[PDB]
Structure 1
Amino acid sequence: PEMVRGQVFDVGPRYTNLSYIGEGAYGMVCSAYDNVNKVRVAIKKISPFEHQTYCQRTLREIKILLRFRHENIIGINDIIRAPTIEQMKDVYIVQDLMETDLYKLLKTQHLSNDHICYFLYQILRGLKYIHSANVLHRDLKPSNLLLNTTCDLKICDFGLARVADATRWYRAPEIMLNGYTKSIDIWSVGCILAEMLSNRPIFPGKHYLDQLNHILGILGSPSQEDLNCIINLKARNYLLSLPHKNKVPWNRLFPNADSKALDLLDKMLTFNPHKRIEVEQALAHPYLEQYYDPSDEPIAEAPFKFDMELDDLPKEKLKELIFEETARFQPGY
């Protein structure tokens, strides 16, 4: 078995020449060469079966990415795991090899207005397809926006995605106030647009309540109509207890930015999720006029459905489901 930084990476003989890329709390990512298709790939090693929540993420990501097919969404090429469920401790997810992500890019480069518009369009184009399948991504952030050798952008990491019915900096305020809609993703995109405009996260809270104070320190205290739409009465009461804060005009934060970008940013970062701009309206915003093309922005064929609920299933049941979902990559299915 091939090894990388002391970790077993049992993906041969099809996949060889592994090179470390990075890792997470329970998964290492490497680049590799696919000797069968003669292409470079990324391979994520996932070891989730001791933790029910990690099993949930793994199954959600697999089920959703295997059903989605869109130029602005990462695909799954192949999945490697053991031939028997008792032997399966790791899952390897093979994907097209990307060059970088927006998080890394923003660390070293200040984006021109042209760059920002181009990246925002692709995010929203990918997001339109996602929402057209009635799916909420729920964890959009710069590190989940990958770029390939030709500067095409692909949304990845659907482990927290849900059918509509790590870092807190990009989470909508209603999440931290306890019915989540497609607007929670629009908020995240607004946070990403703000960060492309300044190479600075706009709401970098050090914890839960500090995050809310950052949001209110820019947007100002919520209006009565905004407060009226907070269903959680206790969160509404806590908001009422806070000292008043005035709205900070967007052009004081970003004095050099395109005024059309600020108008769109304002419509994405509205406190009330019901007044937040939707993805189709965002694509049609004058800021994106040079790219908007509904004849080249495809949508899903039908809304996605998990056919079941995963939140309360034991990890042993989730492992059986991951085994069944990955059988199609085995010789025998």
Structure 2
Amino acid sequence: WEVPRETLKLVERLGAGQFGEVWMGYYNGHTKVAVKSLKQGSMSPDAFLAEANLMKQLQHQRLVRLYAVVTQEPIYIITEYMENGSLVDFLKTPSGIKLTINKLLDMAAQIAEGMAFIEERNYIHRDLRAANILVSDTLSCKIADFGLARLIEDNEYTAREGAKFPIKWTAPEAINYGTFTIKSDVWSFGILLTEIVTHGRIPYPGMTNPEVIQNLERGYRMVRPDNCPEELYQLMRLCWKERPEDRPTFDYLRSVLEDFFTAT
């Protein structure tokens, strides 16, 4: 997994974030790759590398593939390259905008497919959102960013108190109690789905995070997004059941979604 840093040539910078940059580059000359670099101090090298250690365990076509690491500062994680970058952004590009509901549903089923694998392997992602989905040059999607991912032996993960999460994507039980499960990711997927029909629009447009929390306590869910197919909205609804155990599996989601876009 470890390789010389001299085997890479960084070309374009793609993002920067609090914890480091993402680069488009070349490995051993002819291979296009993505390179994630760590900001010396944003977190320990091991903490950064923990993502790689995990990608070694979670390999699947529908999941971004780890290539190698450079374990001397600046630390690098080197991976498969996704030409179209982040799904939130791509959906807004001239290409993404012209995408038919049929293709969007296809992309949704691909994401559920990857999560089903993650589910099968007893992992949780905990950060499932459109930003963390990457699009290839053939418009296939792969899950990425397993920084918050966790192996769940006893059905549930209990977040370190003081941990802050994207309220609008996070399941209530996780927000209020800090308890995460795959059912908790299923909730995030529902929010992801809205993010797909609205071509990368923020969930709960115009609302504050506390506003959202209160509404969910009242039993409200997100208002029907504009131009959202009703059958898709109701599937979005399953993901949002009050009881985590009543939310469906990712394999059920895939199956239905595959049905939805086969029906168009």
TM-score band, normalised by the shorter chain? Answer: 0.7 to 0.9
Distance in 1 separating the partners of 2:208 and 2:196: 21
Give the aligned partner of residue 169 of structure 1.
168
Q: Contact 1:41–1:96 (CA<8 Å) still a contact in 2?
A: yes
Distance in 2 separating the partners of 1:94 and 1:144: 16
Q: Which moved more, 1:137-146 or 1:63-72?
A: 63-72
The Cα shift of 1:202 comes to 2.5
Distance in 1 separating the partners of 2:212 and 2:226: 24
Q: Which moved more, 1:157-166 or 1:69-78?
A: 157-166
Question: Is 1:120 aligned to residue 146 of structure 2?
Answer: no
Where 1:25 maps in the other structure, the secondary structure is coil
Distance in 2 separating the partners of 1:69 and 1:291: 26
Residue 34 and residue 60 in structure 1: after superposition, are their counterparts in 2 closer, same or farther (change >3 A)?
Answer: closer
Letter of the structure 2 residue corresponding to residue 202 of structure 1:
P
Instruction: State which of 82, 89, 93 in structure 2 corresponds to 1:98.
Output: 82
Give the aligned partner of residue 21 of structure 2.
28
Give the aligned partner of residue 236 of structure 2.
265
The Cα shift of 1:67 comes to 1.5
Give the aligned partner of residue 69 of structure 1.
59
Question: Is 1:41 aligned to residue 26 of structure 2?
Answer: no
Residue 290 and residue 210 in structure 1: after superposition, are their counterparts in 2 closer, same or farther (change >3 A)?
Answer: closer
Q: Which moved more, 1:150-159 or 1:269-278?
A: 269-278
Distance in 1 separating the partners of 2:125 and 2:183: 11
Where 1:27 maps in the other structure, the secondary structure is coil
Where 1:122 maps in the other structure, the secondary structure is helix
Across the aligned residues of Structure 1 and Structure 2, the Cα RMSD in angstroms comes to 2.6
Give the aligned partner of residue 160 of structure 2.
none
Counterparts in 2 of 1:48-63, with a 5 A limit?
Answer: 51=43, 55-56=46-47, 58-63=48-53
Letter of the structure 1 residue corresponding to residue 173 of structure 2:
E
The Cα shift of 1:255 comes to 6.0
Distance in 2 separating the partners of 1:261 and 1:183: 18
Q: Contact 2:171–2:184 (CA<8 Å) still a contact in 1?
A: yes
> Can you give the 5+ residue segments of structure 2 that lack an aligned partner in the other structure?
155-164
Give the aligned partner of residue 5 of structure 1.
none
**Alignment deviations for residues 45-101 of structure 1 (CA, whole Å, 9 cap, x no partner):** 11466646x853x2431221011221110111011123xxxxxx4311111121221
Give the aligned partner of residue 316 of structure 1.
none
Distance in 2 separating the partners of 1:212 and 1:46: 33
The Cα shift of 1:254 comes to 3.9
Residue 262 and residue 34 in structure 1: after superposition, are their counterparts in 2 closer, same or farther (change >3 A)?
Answer: same
Where 1:257 maps in the other structure, the secondary structure is coil
Give the aligned partner of residue 229 of structure 1.
none
**Alignment deviations for residues 234-292 of structure 1 (CA, whole Å, 9 cap, x no partner):** xxxxxxxxxxxxx57x8x7246433321221111122321211121222232x422679
Q: Contact 2:167–2:175 (CA<8 Å) still a contact in 1?
A: no
Give the aligned partner of residue 150 of structure 1.
138
Letter of the structure 1 residue corresponding to residue 243 of structure 2:
N
Q: Contact 1:73–1:154 (CA<8 Å) still a contact in 2?
A: yes
> Can you give the 5+ residue segments of structure 1 that lack an aligned partner in the other structure?
1-10, 83-88, 223-246, 293-333
Give the aligned partner of residue 181 of structure 1.
181
Distance in 1 separating the partners of 2:233 and 2:101: 12
Q: Contact 2:66–2:77 (CA<8 Å) still a contact in 1?
A: yes
Distance in 2 separating the partners of 1:98 and 1:134: 26
> What TM-score do the two structures reach when normalised by structure 2?
0.81
Give the aligned partner of residue 193 of structure 2.
193
Q: Contact 1:203–1:214 (CA<8 Å) still a contact in 2?
A: no
Counterparts in 2 of 1:3-18, with a 5 A limit?
Answer: 12-18=5-11
Where 1:123 maps in the other structure, the secondary structure is helix
Amino-acid identity (%): 24
Distance in 2 separating the partners of 1:160 and 1:12: 26
Residue 131 and residue 151 in structure 1: after superposition, are their counterparts in 2 closer, same or farther (change >3 A)?
Answer: same
